[PDB]
Amino acid sequence: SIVIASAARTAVGSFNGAFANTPAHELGATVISAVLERAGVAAGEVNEVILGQVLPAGEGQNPARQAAMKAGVPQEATAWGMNQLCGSGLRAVALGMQQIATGDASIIVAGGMESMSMAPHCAHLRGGVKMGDFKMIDTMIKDGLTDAFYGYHMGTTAENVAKQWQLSRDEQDAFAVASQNKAEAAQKDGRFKDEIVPFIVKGRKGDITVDADEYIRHGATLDSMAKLRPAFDKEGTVTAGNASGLNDGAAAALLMSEAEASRRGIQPLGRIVSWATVGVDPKVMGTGPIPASRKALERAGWKIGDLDLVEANEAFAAQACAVNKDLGWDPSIVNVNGGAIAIGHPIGASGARILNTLLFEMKRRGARKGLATLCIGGGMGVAMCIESL
Amino acid sequence: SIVIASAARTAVGSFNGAFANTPAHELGATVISAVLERAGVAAGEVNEVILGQVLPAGEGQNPARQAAMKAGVPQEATAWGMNQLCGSGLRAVALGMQQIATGDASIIVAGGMESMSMAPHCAHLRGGVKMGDFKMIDTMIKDGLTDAFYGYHMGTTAENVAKQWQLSRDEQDAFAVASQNKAEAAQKDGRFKDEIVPFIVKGRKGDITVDADEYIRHGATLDSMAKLRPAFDKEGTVTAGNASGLNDGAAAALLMSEAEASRRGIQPLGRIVSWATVGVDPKVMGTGPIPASRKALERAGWKIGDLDLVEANEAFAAQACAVNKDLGWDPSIVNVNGGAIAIGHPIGASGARILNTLLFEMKRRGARKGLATLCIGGGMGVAMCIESL
Amino acid sequence: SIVIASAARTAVGSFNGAFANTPAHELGATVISAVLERAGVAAGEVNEVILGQVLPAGEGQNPARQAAMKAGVPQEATAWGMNQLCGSGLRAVALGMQQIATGDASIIVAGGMESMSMAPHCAHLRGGVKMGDFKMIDTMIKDGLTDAFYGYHMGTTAENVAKQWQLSRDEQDAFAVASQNKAEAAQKDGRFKDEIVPFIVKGRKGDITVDADEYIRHGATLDSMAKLRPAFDKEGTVTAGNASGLNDGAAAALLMSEAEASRRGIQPLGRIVSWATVGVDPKVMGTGPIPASRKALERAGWKIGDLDLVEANEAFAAQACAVNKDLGWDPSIVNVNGGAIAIGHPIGASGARILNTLLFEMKRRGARKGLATLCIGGGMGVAMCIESL
Amino acid sequence: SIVIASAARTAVGSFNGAFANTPAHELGATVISAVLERAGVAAGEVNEVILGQVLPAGEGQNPARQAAMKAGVPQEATAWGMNQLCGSGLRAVALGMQQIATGDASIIVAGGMESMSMAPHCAHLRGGVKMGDFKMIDTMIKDGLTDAFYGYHMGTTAENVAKQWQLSRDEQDAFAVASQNKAEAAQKDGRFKDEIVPFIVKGRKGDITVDADEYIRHGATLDSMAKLRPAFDKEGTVTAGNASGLNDGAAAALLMSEAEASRRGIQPLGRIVSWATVGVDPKVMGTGPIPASRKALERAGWKIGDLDLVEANEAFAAQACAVNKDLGWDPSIVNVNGGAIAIGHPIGASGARILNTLLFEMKRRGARKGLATLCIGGGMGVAMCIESL
Numbered sequence A, B, C, D: 001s002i003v004i005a006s007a008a009r010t011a012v013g014s015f016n017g018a019f020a021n022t023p024a025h026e027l028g029a030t031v032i033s034a035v036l037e038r039a040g041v042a043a044g045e046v047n048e049v050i051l052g053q054v055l056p057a058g059e060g061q062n063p064a065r066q067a068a069m070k071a072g073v074p075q076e077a078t079a080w081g082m083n084q085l086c087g088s089g090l091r092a093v094a095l096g097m098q099q100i101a102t103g104d105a106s107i108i109v110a111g112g113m114e115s116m117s118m119a120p121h122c123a124h125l126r127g128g129v130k131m132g133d134f135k136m137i138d139t140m141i142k143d144g145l146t147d148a149f150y151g152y153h154m155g156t157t158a159e160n161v162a163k164q165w166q167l168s169r170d171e172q173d174a175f176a177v178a179s180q181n182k183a184e185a186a187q188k189d190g191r192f193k194d195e196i197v198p199f200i201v202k203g204r205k206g207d208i209t210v211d212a213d214e215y216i217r218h219g220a221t222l223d224s225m226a227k228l229r230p231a232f233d234k235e236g237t238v239t240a241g242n243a244s245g246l247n248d249g250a251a252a253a254l255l256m257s258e259a260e261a262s263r264r265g266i267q268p269l270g271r272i273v274s275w276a277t278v279g280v281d282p283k284v285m286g287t288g289p290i291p292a293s294r295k296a297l298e299r300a301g302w303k304i305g306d307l308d309l310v311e312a313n314e315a316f317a318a319q320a321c322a323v324n325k326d327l328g329w330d331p332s333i334v335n336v337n338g339g340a341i342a343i344g345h346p347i348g349a350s351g352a353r354i355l356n357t358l359l360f361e362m363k364r365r366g367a368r369k370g371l372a373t374l375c376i377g378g379g380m381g382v383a384m385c386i387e388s389l
């Protein structure tokens, strides 16, 4: 029924690094043209562009429409942004699948984009401040990384799961090192090259082509990992080294019925067999993926053991270990090329970034059944099962 | 197959008016609870909440999830926000319907919410400003009302459509006055009572219950209308009087299969027969509804003549006249109780606001076929056809 | 040797009141024009303009020169601002006197101006804020009213003075109320008309002439003052009622040698016999007037008992009572037309505002010896003796 | 009559350089302690502290007093800041002299301090911004470098002066390069060591001692000056290389009667023989020094040819050449150790910084008569004559 004809993602930038002054719709446009080019589909055949994006403050009207127009998709197609926090990227793909499944569209470009670097500071000032100091709020932290129910950071929610699952520092640290070493190993062997579409950082005193994940760290040591101080709980266990980072990036998929891809002679990266989204306690939002994955598997008619490859988003080492511990899937087939701790976590783009890595790894090793899943702030999980053809 | 079991909207606040300090999710909570109580469905039975919202800067992580939790939808449910600018409120409902249509959900609350008053001022300040003044940008203007491709305001787009359609000042003014007069009549006659759920503005020095659309102007004259100066084009034709305003509000609908409503004893407000979204030139974005309405009639298998009631959002008199002129529907069945010029236009909530208006008027006059449509900044239209049961 | 030929002040405005959006330099230029007019002196004869001013942030290069240029003082004269906090308006007069006493000028305009309403919020942003919320600081509080050594408000130094002199709430409120009733009666009787020069607040939708002190409360009651909550110490004694307010105004004096005023046939408002400035502990800065008045009296060769009238500025009733208790002057000759609790406290202007008040009352009742004195944040006092000719 | 018993200055910091986060009062405190130590005068004997400062926004209540307290000056002493823009640090000395001349003080510490790096960005937000962007104003530019009458930067006044005196790019550049070459030669030979007092930048990760002017460029080339583009008039003649910079620093002098220096066995740096301040057209502010120096010499009884050494502040090479051309003093006795284009221009402190340079060079070469003068924004000049004893 619905297949991902092609896919592409930019490299994931570090915070205030290579994409520091790049609006997310510019990386979005590059990724949208990439998918088109890759499948051999003309921009004019796109019905709609669906892009998850959690932090658009200051970017102007509907950045998803700006991305589409800049990538050549005519003014006749439509475009919209959506937010389901970290799940956005993946959710958007399911939403475009639904556009086709109900017969409302033929071809959708879906994924997410995000510029955490470009997220601005703000204040509500229409009433005015008659007397006294007032806070300038960092919208990336307020609107993207702070739980709205308990007022604390995602990091504390990770601590909640750490304590609850009795996941020691050394255990999270071990997990972190492995994702670095695995992300570094994969990048060195050219395993991220099919998925990445170089992005040209338009300069003045030089244009720069970015085609490598700059957030991965080469030669990560356990010693350096164990000397870092806890970033959220002063006598905590979560640190900067075992937590994902603040990053920029964009990732997308080209969707169409399976019959359509056959009419066009396209070899699809996979069929979307199912997807799902379930809520959980906001305090332990990191557990999100447990219920959602299970549901997704139930809806696809598959067992956990049927999965050949898995991409479970690395928000925090504590949550990742808890996910894997509970689900019990074989660790060796999960984040084979490294995860968000090494790669990065451009919130609104991450769900599509991990779908790209899944998709191109599944083709590369010939795996048939796959699943991508992410935890979501506010206590939610999103999962999707993909099957190759 | 999918019906609108119940619906509710808060009154529409004036800018920095009744809801001046009310966060959009608060307005949404109340509309989530209203739709739930008006259909007899428990919050625990809600699977997902979808809320169109264009300006959430600074409201924290995913205001839709905040709204849902505040209203009592359990943490096991899911929520998300989406942005197709002005069509957001209506598109949510279509998106929600698709959730049930693909069997991924049973019961959904969809609509939109917006606090234009609470939109903050922002600046990207991570680099630091070594020297020189910098701009604190109004996200309301920048992210909600400015065309991202031509840099001008929506009002200019309206001017483009007036010139194009040769719509004179007097003819735009005549439409505005009638909109005010129909809204005022409607309000005096208790015609907005069913759809409105009174909202309690939690005070300190007292609570204030708001149950009336405060932006409608009583006794609007043609003289006062003709004295106003053009707001966007210095020697233009669009004024503050013949353009909608800046406003706050929320509206939603409770969706479920026709079968499910039947199992429950609910008498639905309507069956969603079709919906459609189409793009047009950003410069003449107000023509959006033409192609969109036509596409949705096509998908429903209806002729324009088949409609008994229409709600075509009045962003600007010049675009509303163009639309009506083009489509040729009977003016007498369009915005029977007044439109956005009088009622206001809380961006992300406006499509759900007009769906409420349509739906309660179809039940009260016994209309069978109705259509709701809105122009969208960036150059898009959205439309939905509803049939009574 | 040096006399005050004439003086003028603007009415004192309420915080964000009649001069809510009037830069201080506009209020200062009207006072410069009035002192000139009053003395029969032309703006081309002024050598230098000296204006105390504590909060000039954002008003642009040297506001004293902006006021001087606006008044028509030639470009060949000079002008400068100074800041000895609340004693500023009075210390500028002392400093203007000194220019003439040393032969460096013949004609000086000296006093103060302040727009507390127009003070801005600020932040040091050159280095950049990598991430996190940051404070926008009210410059009026931080630079005008917070002690820099102890970090608390001037209000807390008043509580310190209340404890140490054992001043009860009741005694302070009675002083406060008498301050209001004396001001009201001298306002109603027209005793502020001579000193005040009307200020024209330039409208758009109408020019407004301001010629009355608007912070003075009419029919102030003991009861409503008694009911107020402490404002600085949750369980203190200083309240908004018995403390001075936040205000806007300007005030000045025209100076020249006695011999010069004699050549011109000018009947001066008085001779500056002496002045003094002395420091005290910043914790009890309200006590400043004690050592400073004793020193000005000593330098004049006068006993406390030789004074006929006194203007002892009312920062807080706690400190005014203390000052009066220690000096032991007859209370009936102190602030006979009310004081700053009623009239207000536009920080840099205050010392010249009370000087104007002293001057015009000395002329009206034929008082021969007077003194003006103020307390100063930071732990200082300033006083000036004046004798009539 | 009045002498300068001792003097000291901190090295001049580069913009956002060595003193990037050092509040001005900390730099002033080290210079007050240096002057005391230098004169064998204890802080308990100081009567008053007078500090020129143009941009104190956000540093808290009267920074002059903060500096004085930090240096141990007793709370019984007084302190104030003043602002005659660029003339401030020199005016402070003339005003402190006046304190003593009139018998109100015996011992004064007077000069200036400025942290242009710490000046903040601000906005008047008390009335609120109902809608539309607002500017965050750079207080350094607005309040220190922008002319309030014509709206343009001090650099445009320099273009006015270059046009009017027909100073070519080439001649300004040759003046700029010799200013750098002379300051560098003086720094390398140890000539700034007597006047500089080392300032310790209290760090966390290490304390840094700053005792070298860091803005002076070594091996400055004419070629590099010539290639620069005009900074203020796109087709102008003033550039970043021929203009002074934005800088941080403090400087002062300790003052007492000549008879009191004699009682103490102090060998003073000089006798203040006269000073003067005169205005000029704001558009040609740079010419300030002409009438002020001519008036100061007149008051001294000196002809221009009587001076042995001159410090004429180099705001811009255009105005410094105009001054020199008009006055006609032998250029080889002016700014013999380089001037502000090389050393820097910490607005409020500059006048005291060049007074320190004059004094210590007069003592080294045995120069008997000197003069220090500066141009001032808003159209003013200040000058001081000094004779050695």
Ligand SMILES: CC(=O)SCCNC(=O)CCNC(=O)[C@H](O)C(C)(C)COP(=O)(O)OP(=O)(O)OC[C@H]1O[C@@H](n2cnc3c(N)ncnc32)[C@H](O)[C@@H]1OP(=O)(O)O
Residues within 6 Å of the ligand: A086, A144, A145, A154, A155, A176, A180, A217, A220, A221, A224, A225, A228, A231, A239, A240, A241, A242, A243, A244, A245, A246, A285, A286, A315, A345, A347, A374, A375, A376, A377, C131
């Ligand atoms: C459901 C969900 O998915 S919710 C999650 C959505 N995203 C999040 O919740 C946020 C996760 N990320 C964050 O919030 C941030 O990245 C934080 C708070 C963990 C870290 O923020 P910062 O302190 O600004 O990060 P930063 O990159 O500076 O880390 C600090 C240091 O850790 C070091 N570090 C990080 N990883 C490693 C590692 N593997 N090995 C060694 N050093 C490391 C960095 O190199 C840096 O060194 P430095 O101090 O010399 O610069």
Ligand SMILES: CC(=O)SCCNC(=O)CCNC(=O)[C@H](O)C(C)(C)COP(=O)(O)OP(=O)(O)OC[C@H]1O[C@@H](n2cnc3c(N)ncnc32)[C@H](O)[C@@H]1OP(=O)(O)O
Residues within 6 Å of the ligand: B086, B145, B154, B155, B176, B180, B217, B220, B221, B224, B225, B228, B231, B239, B240, B241, B242, B243, B244, B245, B246, B285, B286, B314, B315, B316, B345, B374, B375, B376, B377
């Ligand atoms: C696809 C699309 O939908 S795009 C549309 C999305 N929304 C928009 O595009 C914006 C349209 N609305 C706007 O941008 C604004 O409301 C504007 C620019 C037209 C007006 O903004 P403002 O100038 O701040 O509006 P405001 O309410 O002050 O109008 C000014 C005056 O007009 C008067 N006025 C307005 N309507 C009338 C009337 N019918 N009769 C008499 N006077 C009237 C107001 O009462 C007011 O009088 P006042 O100056 O004494 O207060």
Ligand SMILES: CC(=O)SCCNC(=O)CCNC(=O)[C@H](O)C(C)(C)COP(=O)(O)OP(=O)(O)OC[C@H]1O[C@@H](n2cnc3c(N)ncnc32)[C@H](O)[C@@H]1OP(=O)(O)O
Residues within 6 Å of the ligand: A131, C086, C145, C154, C155, C180, C217, C220, C221, C224, C225, C228, C231, C239, C240, C241, C242, C243, C244, C245, C246, C285, C286, C314, C315, C316, C345, C375, C376, C377
């Ligand atoms: C050495 C030196 O001079 S330092 C002194 C320099 N100035 C200062 O130190 C500060 C003194 N002033 C202040 O800081 C402020 O005015 C404060 C903190 C005391 C009050 O600030 P606010 O709380 O914002 O003042 P505000 O005007 O709102 O007073 C609150 C209320 O008291 C009421 N009130 C004040 N005086 C009276 C009175 N005499 N009778 C009855 N009610 C009164 C006001 O009407 C107001 O009523 P409301 O809440 O219904 O509006």
Ligand SMILES: CC(=O)SCCNC(=O)CCNC(=O)[C@H](O)C(C)(C)COP(=O)(O)OP(=O)(O)OC[C@H]1O[C@@H](n2cnc3c(N)ncnc32)[C@H](O)[C@@H]1OP(=O)(O)O
Residues within 6 Å of the ligand: B131, D086, D145, D153, D154, D155, D180, D217, D220, D221, D224, D225, D228, D231, D239, D240, D241, D242, D243, D244, D245, D246, D285, D286, D315, D316, D345, D375, D376, D377
């Ligand atoms: C009365 C009165 O005194 S009014 C005067 C008060 N002060 C003023 O009016 C302002 C004077 N100064 C200024 O406004 C500023 O210094 C300006 C606008 C001229 C320059 O500001 P900026 O552009 O930010 O200065 P900046 O230090 O970056 O200069 C730019 C470049 O010129 C280069 N430059 C400056 N001088 C030289 C030189 N002598 N040789 C070679 N290069 C030089 C700098 O090295 C820098 O190179 P980069 O771009 O690789 O960094």
